[PDB]
Design an enzyme around this catalytic site. Structure first.
Site, short mmCIF file in Angstrom:
data_model
loop_
_atom_site.label_atom_id
_atom_site.label_comp_id
_atom_site.label_asym_id
_atom_site.label_seq_id
_atom_site.Cartn_x
_atom_site.Cartn_y
_atom_site.Cartn_z
N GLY A 78 51.63 43.84 41.26
CA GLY A 78 53.05 44.01 41.05
C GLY A 78 53.37 45.22 40.19
N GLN A 157 55.67 37.51 44.45
CA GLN A 157 56.25 37.14 43.16
C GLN A 157 57.75 36.95 43.32
OE1 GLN A 157 56.30 40.29 40.15
NE2 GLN A 157 55.74 38.80 38.56
N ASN A 214 43.63 41.65 37.23
CA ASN A 214 44.57 42.75 37.42
C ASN A 214 44.08 43.69 38.51
OD1 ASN A 214 46.33 41.89 35.34
ND2 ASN A 214 45.06 42.91 33.79
N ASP A 216 44.60 46.84 38.70
CA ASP A 216 44.22 48.12 38.13
C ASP A 216 42.98 48.03 37.24
OD1 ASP A 216 45.35 46.68 36.10
OD2 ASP A 216 46.73 48.25 35.43
N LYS A 375 45.42 52.78 32.28
CA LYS A 375 46.80 52.72 31.84
C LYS A 375 47.33 54.06 31.35
CE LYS A 375 45.76 51.10 27.13
NZ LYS A 375 44.46 51.81 27.32
#
Ligand SMILES: CC(=O)OC[C@@]1(C)C=Cc2c(c(C)cc3c2[nH]c2cc(O)ccc23)O1
Length: 483
Positions: A78, A157, A214, A216, A375
């Site tokens: 997401g 979601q 996650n 990522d 990140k």
């Protein structure tokens, strides 16, 4: 109904928009809780540190390939890369050798199917913002996933309304009827799994374990040693944690509570420890100091979670088709940028908080390589470089010439926080960082093709109205390159 008018308005708005009844059930219970005084705060007095845990590096036995035939891989998908200035699904970012995050997990699953288990299932949790790009990406590159995308792969979601802090009514916004909805955190995977019927479908078809992580996080790969440790120890919910560093003092941590059940009449008084999560939003302003003490609270959640699916279904059914996670009560504004808009509450939950909802829940400390999130653009550069190598089973691991540690990359925040700035830096090529302990870049810089860096390098430009170009083939060994 036994609901207040504000709650009634909330369900009415959600039923009109065709939101499914499982999301409505879950949101309203949080709404009722907040209308009874619940703030979400967890003081230090309410918890204890957790001192002793088993470790993954103490394990050696792998599971059978029969267990993998009953295992689902769920990736959270997401996230937009807004922190790096991105508009699209973070998982569709080129990370190495022309391949995305999604490419690698899909190739990892493809490998496990051909070699180990043909019924290993792969699922994605998408938002409305990432669904279309994710679908299109699979059409072009992985048609076996695209053909079963809606029916098997995609998990949507849902969205929940923001409520005003005075009335708890659904906030209205005349300009944009979109700023009056919000996502409910990644704790919504349980609501989406149950509400769509997919959780029931999975247990029905014989699936026992689900590995969630996650999208990522490239370190989050199937480890057969964890599945064997869950079989043998009869564990229903397992959370991977890592040792906290001072780089992680502002992030969440694991904690401990105890429940004494009194023995009826002449009996021994039983004990059960219960693990829980405390993020910064849940920590009162007074206790932020104890929050950042990485020797008192020394473990943090990786969001690598292993779940026994039949037990998840049973627990949710026993609660009337929901999982009652602790509610996180965000204090923001209807329009996030504009602080003149009415104050709202954004109610969300964390999927890691489910560790408190199971009797046989545990946590295992894993090495930091299991938590390799991208990140910042600095993380991207390290991952793009030859410091990382792909295996035959399509995992990303350090080269042995990196002595167990990735190169440390500090990029100037004025020029490389955004992706367009970072891609200008590596326009002519990404340098060799495999033999590089540290590299830091200040000011405007462009690498050249075939660059090789060794040791600790610093490239700084003091003139912000200029660009520093490094030629092709430049060797940089323990130095400071400057104009
Ligand atoms: C701190 C400690 O007690 O070690 C235990 C454990 C689980 C956690 C720390 C840790 C690690 C490994 C294998 C790599 C790194 C790491 N912390 C890091 C910080 C960085 O900035 C870069 C790389 C690492 O192992």
């Amino acid at each position: 109904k036994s609901l207040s008018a504000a709650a009634q308005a909330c369900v009415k708005k959600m039923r009109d928009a065709k939101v499914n009844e499982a999301c409505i059930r879950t949101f309203i219970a949080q709404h009722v809780m907040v209308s009874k005084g619940e703030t979400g705060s967890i003081p230090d007095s309410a918890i204890m540190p957790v001192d002793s845990l088993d470790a993954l590096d103490s394990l050696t036995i792998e599971c059978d390939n029969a267990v993998l035939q009953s295992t689902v891989v769920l990736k959270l998908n997401g996230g937009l890369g807004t922190g790096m200035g991105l508009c699209d699904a973070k998982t569709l970012l080129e990370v190495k050798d022309g391949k995305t995050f999604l490419d690698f997990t899909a190739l990892q699953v493809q490998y496990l199917r051909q070699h180990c288990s043909e019924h290993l299932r792969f699922m994605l949790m998408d938002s409305f913002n990432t669904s279309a790009s994710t679908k299109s990406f699979l059409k072009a590159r992985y048609p076996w996933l695209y053909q079963v995308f809606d029916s098997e792969v995609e998990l949507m979601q849902n969205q929940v309304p923001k409520i005003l802090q005075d009335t708890l009514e659904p906030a209205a916004w005349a300009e944009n009827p979109a700023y009056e909805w919000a996502p409910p955190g990644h704790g919504d995977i349980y609501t989406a799994l149950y509400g769509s019927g997919k959780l029931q479908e999975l247990v029905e078809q014989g699936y026992r374990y689900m590995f969630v992580s996650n999208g990522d996080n490239l370190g989050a790969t199937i480890d057969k040693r964890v599945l064997a440790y869950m079989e043998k120890e009869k564990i229903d919910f397992l959370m991977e944690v890592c040792r906290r560093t001072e780089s992680d003092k502002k992030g969440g941590h694991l904690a401990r509570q105890t429940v004494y059940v009194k023995g009826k009449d002449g009996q021994p008084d039983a004990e059960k420890r219960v693990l829980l999560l405390r993020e910064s939003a849940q920590c009162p302003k007074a206790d932020m100091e104890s929050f950042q003490d990485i020797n008192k609270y020394s473990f943090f959640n990786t969001n690598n979670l292993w779940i026994r699916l039949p037990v998840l279904l049973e627990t949710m059914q026993e609660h009337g088709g929901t999982l009652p996670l602790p509610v996180i009560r965000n204090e923001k504004t209807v329009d996030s940028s504009n602080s003149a808009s009415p104050k709202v509450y954004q109610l969300e939950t964390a999927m890691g908080a489910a560790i408190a909802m199971f009797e046989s829940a545990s946590a295992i400390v894993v090495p930091r390589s299991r938590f390799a999130p991208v990140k910042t653009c600095a993380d991207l550069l390290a991952l793009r470089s030859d410091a990382y190598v792909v295996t035959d089973d399509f995992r990303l691991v350090l080269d042995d010439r990196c002595h167990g540690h990735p190169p440390v990359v500090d990029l100037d925040s004025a020029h490389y926080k955004m992706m367009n700035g970072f891609e200008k830096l590596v326009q002519h090529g990404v340098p060799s960082l495999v033999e590089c302990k540290r590299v830091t870049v200040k000011g405007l810089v462009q690498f050249g093709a075939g660059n090789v860096l060794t040791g600790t390098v610093t490239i700084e430009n003091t003139d912000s109205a200029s660009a520093f170009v490094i030629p092709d083939g430049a060797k940089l060994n323990d130095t400071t390159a400057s104009p």
